Design a protein around this ligand. Sequence first.
Ligand SMILES: NC(=O)c1ccc[n+]([C@@H]2O[C@H](COP(=O)([O-])OP(=O)(O)OC[C@H]3O[C@@H](n4cnc5c(N)ncnc54)[C@H](O)[C@@H]3O)[C@@H](O)[C@H]2O)c1
Lengths: 331, 327
Amino acid sequence: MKIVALFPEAVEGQENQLLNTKKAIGLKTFLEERGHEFIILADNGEDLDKHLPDMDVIISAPFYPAYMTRERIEKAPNLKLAITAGVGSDHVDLAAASEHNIGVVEVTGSNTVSVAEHAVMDLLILLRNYEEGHRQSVEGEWNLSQVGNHAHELQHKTIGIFGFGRIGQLVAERLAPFNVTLQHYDPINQQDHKLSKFVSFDELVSSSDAITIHAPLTPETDNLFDKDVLSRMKKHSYLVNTARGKIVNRDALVEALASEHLQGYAGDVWYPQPAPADHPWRTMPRNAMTVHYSGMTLEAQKRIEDGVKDILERFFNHEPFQDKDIIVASG
Amino acid sequence: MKIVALFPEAVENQLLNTKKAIGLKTFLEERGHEFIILGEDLDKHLPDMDVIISAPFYPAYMTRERIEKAPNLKLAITAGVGSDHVDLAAASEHNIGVVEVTGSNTVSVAEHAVMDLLILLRNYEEGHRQSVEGEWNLSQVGNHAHELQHKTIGIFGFGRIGQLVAERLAPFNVTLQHYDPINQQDHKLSKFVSFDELVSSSDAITIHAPLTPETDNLFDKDVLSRMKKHSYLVNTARGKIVNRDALVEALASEHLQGYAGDVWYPQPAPADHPWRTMPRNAMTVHYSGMTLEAQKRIEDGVKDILERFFNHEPFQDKDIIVASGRI
Ligand SMILES: NC(=O)c1ccc[n+]([C@@H]2O[C@H](COP(=O)([O-])OP(=O)(O)OC[C@H]3O[C@@H](n4cnc5c(N)ncnc54)[C@H](O)[C@@H]3O)[C@@H](O)[C@H]2O)c1
């Protein structure tokens, strides 16, 4: 079986990174030890194309995805398994993958905590106006009026958690001790929790001091926070989205910041990814974006390495995956 | 009473302001006092002012020279905490009361420190530079990006803020350890530990101690190097606890992966303070006393003092710097 991987390019010195072309999350030996062919693409597109005829299994991370469009899938008569090194498979045409009977699996669980940490950090950076505080530090300055102007304690604020699954809940736990009212909305998790009051969406949107997103990208969350929803959110509120870029309307969110309806936006997830160099989210007012590594913390890497490995093991001998892990099922 | 306030010009829903002036306009003229907001070339005012008010980051200086000229002044209010700007000696002798608003930012400081831990370990600074910069490395940012979870965090100084920081760190599933000269029992939350051990065993250390003669320069070149490789230091206690220049050596050599905090030697930090420019800092200037609800706190306090003064009531001693006749 021939296994193709796309990973970020290794850089001299960065001897830590697991998920790159050099250390390639341990698969070279792991694979080449089991009789299989292993191809790491430093290519993305065009060098991808020359493997489509024969790749048995494709592998990539959401942070740096090999897009499996219908176009590409149809070219891959050998392909049986698309593994997402991480969580988030929107880089794969599920519909076509389904129709060609390719399986699609990601490593559920592997980086939930990481992402929670990143989100509460974002709350803090946003409310505390860390950005201004650090700019002034860096730029020679010392001006408390202008930092002060947007600096808030997180304490006593009301936080709305949109999507109260694994990460939503991890975020509640860590936010609870900061003395803050929690509300959440989830289709299903619609009971009060020890930590959060269930609330309608309408209500989450309008009553939250800031909102953090922990919802999947489904037909309902697709472009959910458009001009209309942003509009309905409290004036001067904040928004944190480390779930998926597309939930939040690229352009609407800009107009919301520039007009100052929204006090700030942070998160680490983009449409599309990689974020093109001129993505307006990079440059826009009062942002605390980072590039997309929150679920790619170093420790997160081991967890991913170990999942991809376990998957490939089960795959190679017809052992059935944990349901956790299956996006599209295959025979 | 005629009440004078110096605040900065506006520019800004800041409260300590020529525009918002912590609400003293209507508050005062609604109980019939005169209210004058301003520059310190209103000497042209101090013959007869009953009360002066200012904030510590933009003081009206009450020099002996000016106090002698100010014979009707009964109350100097500092909108905030820190009355360096008032000659207490003279205050005392001309029986002016000097009072402060003991606005209480323990929680603020704790949040700030916890955020610094996050920014440091997760590699937010690089993560954000790449963003703004239009890059998309991933080896670069991932290379030093860590979960806070599972890390051992050492708290140097287990008073209110340390404790406040513990409670917030607890649900992140880290090992907490602390050193305290007094709370040397295990805490349901942090294991007591010797300072030696704090230094050498901690993944990141946060300083929550007071500036005493034994905390002065405690984090010098020796303790910094006794700390593990690639560890992190966060200091929102006082700048001189950490040796200004040693720490720069400690980053530059990459013994320390990171340093953040909002306290400096001296403060305000000189424009060229090396901690500004040093590698892998997450320093801010020291606002925090400065948050919007720190302003509401001050607002309410300046009001409560003025109200007390007006109805001739007693004060909290915590608020009187120089006591005086009424007071
Ligand atoms: N930044 C990263 O590196 C990274 C890593 C892991 C996960 N994530 C993202 O974070 C999100 C949260 O992941 P998780 O593990 O908590 O998944 P989860 O399944 O535990 O959480 C999703 C929850 O949202 C709810 N939900 C479903 N449809 C909804 C809708 N229309 N409106 C609101 N809520 C809805 C569901 O009830 C579900 O329980 C995921 O969608 C994932 O893509 C990103």
